[PDB]
């Protein structure tokens, strides 16, 4: 065949998004979890199966202890990551990686060891002709079809911010902020406890993740919505657990995403996500700032909450000069924007010479990641 | 334990000072090496000049 | 006592090494003072010659 | 009189500890149990007495079904709690609550409804000039006379962990772990059954509570003590039941408190108490951790077992940097540390303005608990 | 008493250096930080103390958010500066400012508002008979005992460069370069992240400041030292955190001060510190340049790194005519050179008539700073 296709995988924490390069959507999207039978089984003709990977672990949740292998964009456990990639290629996509070049995404300001060990596994585990590791935020920018913007990337791993102008990139102005979907989940199960609902274990920690994926929203003013929580009517929502227990969540619902704009609630000094965007834009040159204000791109899974775009717009407009208009461009489909940006990149004809070849790795070693790529 | 651990602390305090002397003397060794190279580079520039 | 007695030997050996490094870095700094005075005197000879 | 004295009550589950503020020890300590005549009585000139409260229920145990009204720091049944407080004030202390301000203790991360309903009862059941609800762990810290520490609070209700630095407090670093004295009792009566002793009812459930209050101890290494259980000599102890039956308990004795350090035995994923302390200390700022490692305070009734302090010291020292020395300060008298901390607090002159007044409640309602106090 | 003594304070950013004029060293040197309790405290009989100032804030770091009140030689917050000076006079020196004339240092090319507001506070906050505001670089030149030189002043605030010849001064040839100790700290915590160590908050931002104050050094050739970072031996150093965590820093160590000579690493176009010195010397008259090349004086806290003097010598000698010899005079004690220059100035008998009097301010207002003094 011509061009050989190519393979693209996004592994921020929480979800593997994977598929062929040259398509508009990934074939396989599943949770990045390795769930191990904690309870010793007593039957004959079970499994045994040392561990379960992917949405198999979601189905068989109650037995398992679940371990996310990626925390804060950092792989904690390498064998668990290899198992997840083994699951992507053989269980879903049914590809031999020898037949495809593979793009990986990776997060900004990330330890060198993750990029270098990630390449070491791609060559010396799944034999592969070529690969690339690319920055998450630039891929979302490509997916949005814009040449310029400040990309606010927040996954389940960590939050990142990369300003770009006309292509280029500003290394000093790149900001990484330790907040995530996962930290909002840990805050959320903590704020359910005051209501009497106690979720203590990894299995129902993913149940509050599912709650937060739909019920939670961001206030267009926090204090105003917290004041109208005195007359509870629309702010309460009934939620059904898989147990058949019913949960009723009021003001507790919208103050969980409020943590992004008030990290004093989590107990971290690190500024809210709108001030981090100001911190990135202020580090940029005076000239370009006009379009960075007007071309803010949201990406990732934890920018999905209803009303985030409006809240960021009101806060950035309030802080900034009202001399210029602050447009925020946050697409629906923004969850998959990194994977789509990886699809478009590996489909680019020129990019087919910028691959890290297997040959170039075999001569010059794993350290060449940083030398060739950003 | 205190007699031996206190010897460990005394020997370690002498060690920290001997190591500090190694660092101060290595400081001087590096300074003198930098001066040696500056003067030797000047010597070579001055051999070429002479 | 055995942890601090074997580490006392490690710390005595590291004192002997810290002191050896004091002596080695001092000895080498002093060798460099001689090398430096030699290249400084050769530089002064070449500079005086130049 | 000057200052009016004040009243202090600790109600974690299991025991009411109550007395005057301004004294070193509580006057009244008794089990928090409401025991009801399950068997219909046939005589004339009995009682009748609908239910028995306190150590009266301990004396007349066999007739009664006993109900703990507090489970996991949560009051299950409010009338039963009111009856227990009615018993404290009138049966033991012989006070009119109208003549005294009353301090209540309460557990961290606890439902709002317990604090708000607890205040509602204190004002609208026992008419009282003023009250306060306070966190259990901070009171034990005051009792220990230290300004800084990480307080490991474990009662019969639930286990809690509050790091404190120079006063202050860290809300994100507060941890609550669902283990208790009561869960160790339920584990213990389960591990007696393999020996043939079967305790099936509430009355002898308090007999295994009494066994565990003296016979049980914590291993300085679990596997080593379980290995030396092959040659049974000192590890067996004869215990006398009130029936006159004799119980002989070997390795079963020390593996009951081992559950605190291995909740895989109870079947919960939730980490052992030493890893929960690491989880709290890791959530704290880098700077303060040095003294939190060296100023761990144990409090509550289920830190009374012999050898807990040594086991926690060995495990926390093994996990932590050995760069710094891990002192654990676990006083004898640690059982009553919360009540003593409440005695000292209500004796403080400045604290006499921070009371929730009856007047302030009558104007602003029961919801003001969270607004004024932590 | 005769002469009344006098008081001298250096406030570049980062450190107050203060003491009596007429002494060789300042009595009090402490960090210019106002640290506020961010976490609400829950005890009784704490503080309260709205904020902590000086090395008190260094001791109690983890609770506090720390705010430097001076950025880039500019006071951001005036009340915070007044609090710092209140701390110098009453907490350390124990002086009534009414009894002493006070010298302040201040940075070149600095906003008029800082000098004029600084005088306004000195007269109308701490009542004082007289004061002076003086340029930082000239004071270091006095301290070095030389009449001529080009003073490279770099504090934690900003970098400045003032050529002087036989006294005099050249206003057009004065250069100010926005680099500092603080910008090297922000670069440094950014370059630690690639190694996996993530320092996200103000408290451990001062921990990387302490690292950089000893571990960091300047390469006598950057590329040569970066090449020998392949065989890591002496370039790695173990560092102990106050947490008890160990940090191991290799090539990352010496490329942090390299930013002074390569501001392309920070992302600023503004030339390296050796080209800024050339830019200042080139703006000077042809005749004097011979001694300015041979009488370069380094001052301030961020000229303390080992090997800066040698690197500046090699680069300035490489760029300049080798027709003349480029001596750099960088004393040890160069950190305190501005304060010593202020000590010598206020001890000068003639200088005792050039003070801005309180009377002259009361008649002619705060604007007279620029009219009388440079």
Curated annotation (Swiss-Prot), chains A, D, E:
Tell me the Gene Ontology biological-process terms attached to this UniProt entry: mesenchyme migration; positive regulation of gene expression; skeletal muscle fiber development; skeletal muscle thin filament assembly
Q: Which domain of life is it from?
A: Eukaryota
Identify the SUPFAM superfamilies for this entry.
Answer: Actin-like ATPase domain
Question: What are the start and end residues of every segment in region (Interaction with alpha-actinin)?
Answer: 109-122, 357-369
Gene Ontology MF terms in the entry = ATP binding; hydrolase activity
- PTM annotation: Oxidation of Met-43 and Met-46 by MICALs (MICAL1, MICAL2 or MICAL3) to form methionine sulfoxide promotes actin filament depolymerization. MICAL1 and MICAL2 produce the (R)-S-oxide form. The (R)-S-oxide form is reverted by MSRB1 and MSRB2, which promotes actin repolymerization.
- InterPro entries noted in UniProt: Actin, Actin/actin-like_CS, Actin_CS, ATPase_NBD
N6-methyllysine-modified residues are 83
List-wise, which residues carry Tele-methylhistidine?
Answer: 72
Catalytic activity annotation: ATP + H2O = ADP + phosphate + H(+)
In this UniProt entry, the residues modified to Methionine (R)-sulfoxide are 43, 46
Decide whether keyword ATP-binding is in the record: yes
Record's function text: Actins are highly conserved proteins that are involved in various types of cell motility and are ubiquitously expressed in all eukaryotic cells.
Q: What else is known?
A: In vertebrates 3 main groups of actin isoforms, alpha, beta and gamma have been identified. The alpha actins are found in muscle tissues and are a major constituent of the contractile apparatus. The beta and gamma actins coexist in most cell types as components of the cytoskeleton and as mediators of internal cell motility.
| Protein name as annotated | Actin, alpha skeletal muscle
What organism does the UniProt record list as the source? Mus musculus
Kindly list the organism's lineage. Eukaryota, Metazoa, Chordata, Craniata, Vertebrata
Curated annotation (Swiss-Prot), chains B, C:
| Inducers of expression | Induced in stimulated quiescent cells.
The free-text domain remark for this protein reads:
The molecule is in a coiled coil structure that is formed by 2 polypeptide chains. The sequence exhibits a prominent seven-residues periodicity.
Please give the residue positions where the record annotates the modification Phosphoserine. 13, 25, 45
Function, as annotated, reads:
Binds to actin filaments in muscle and non-muscle cells. Plays a central role, in association with the troponin complex, in the calcium dependent regulation of vertebrate striated muscle contraction. Smooth muscle contraction is regulated by interaction with caldesmon. In non-muscle cells is implicated in stabilizing cytoskeleton actin filaments.
Q: What else is known?
A: The sequences of cardiac and skeletal muscles are identical.
Q: How does it assemble?
A: Homodimer. Heterodimer of an alpha (TPM1, TPM3 or TPM4) and a beta (TPM2) chain. Interacts with HRG (via the HRR domain); the interaction contributes to the antiangiogenic properties of the histidine/proline-rich region (HRR) of HRG. Interacts (via N-terminus) with LMOD2 (via N-terminus) and TMOD1 (via N-terminus).
Q: Where in the cell is it found?
A: Cytoplasm, Cytoskeleton
User: Which protein family is named in the record?
Assistant: Belongs to the tropomyosin family.
Source superkingdom:
Eukaryota
This chain's protein is named Tropomyosin alpha-1 chain
């Amino acid at each position: 065949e011509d061009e050989t296709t190519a393979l693209v995988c996004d592994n921020g924490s929480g979800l593997v998004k994977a598929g062929f390069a040259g398509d508009d959507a990934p074939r396989a999207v599943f949770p990045s979890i390795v769930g191990r039978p904690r309870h010793q089984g007593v039957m004959v003709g079970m499994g045994q199966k040392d561990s379960y990977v992917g949405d198999e672990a979601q189905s068989k949740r109650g037995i398992l202890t679940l371990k996310y292998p990626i925390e804060h964009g950092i792989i904690t456990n390498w064998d668990d990551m290899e198992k997840i990639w083994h699951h992507t290629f053989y269980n879903e996509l049914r590809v031999a990686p020898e037949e495809h070049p593979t793009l990986l995404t990776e997060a900004p300001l990330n330890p060198k060891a993750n990029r270098e060990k990630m390449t070491q596994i791609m060559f010396e585990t799944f034999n592969v002709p070529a690969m690339y590791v690319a920055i998450q935020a630039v891929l979302s920018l490509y997916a949005s079809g814009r040449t310029t913007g400040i990309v606010l990337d927040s996954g389940d791993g960590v939050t990142h911010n990369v300003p770009i102008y006309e292509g280029y990139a500003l290394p000093h102005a790149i900001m990484r902020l330790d907040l995530a979907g996962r930290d909002l989940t840990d805050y959320l199960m903590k704020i359910l406890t005051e209501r009497g609902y106690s979720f203590v274990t990894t299995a129902e920690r993913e149940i509050v993740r599912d709650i937060k994926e739909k019920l939670c929203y961001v206030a267009l003013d926090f204090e105003n919505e917290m004041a109208t929580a005195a007359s509870s009517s629309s702010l309460e929502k009934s939620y059904e657990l898989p147990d058949g227990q019913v949960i009723t969540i009021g003001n507790e619902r919208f103050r969980c995403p409020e943590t992004l704009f008030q990290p004093s609630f989590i107990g971290m000094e690190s500024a809210g996500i709108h001030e981090t965007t100001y911190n990135s834009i202020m580090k940029c040159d005076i000239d370009i700032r006009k379009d960075l204000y007007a071309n803010n791109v949201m990406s990732g899974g934890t920018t999905m909450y209803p009303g985030i775009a409006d809240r960021m717009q009101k806060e950035i407009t309030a802080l900034a000069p009202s001399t210029m208009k602050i447009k925020i461009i946050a697409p629906p489909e923004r969850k998959y924007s990194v994977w789509i940006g990886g699809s478009i990149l590996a489909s680019l004809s020129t990019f087919q010479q910028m691959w890290i070849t297997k040959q170039e790795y075999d001569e010059a070693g794993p350290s060449i990641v940083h030398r060739k790529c950003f | 334990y205190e007699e031996v651990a206190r010897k460990l602390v005394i020997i370690e305090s002498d060690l920290e000072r001997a190591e500090e002397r190694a660092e101060l003397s290595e400081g001087k060794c590096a300074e003198l090496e930098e001066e040696l190279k500056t003067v030797t580079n000047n010597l070579k520039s001055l051999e070429a000049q002479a």
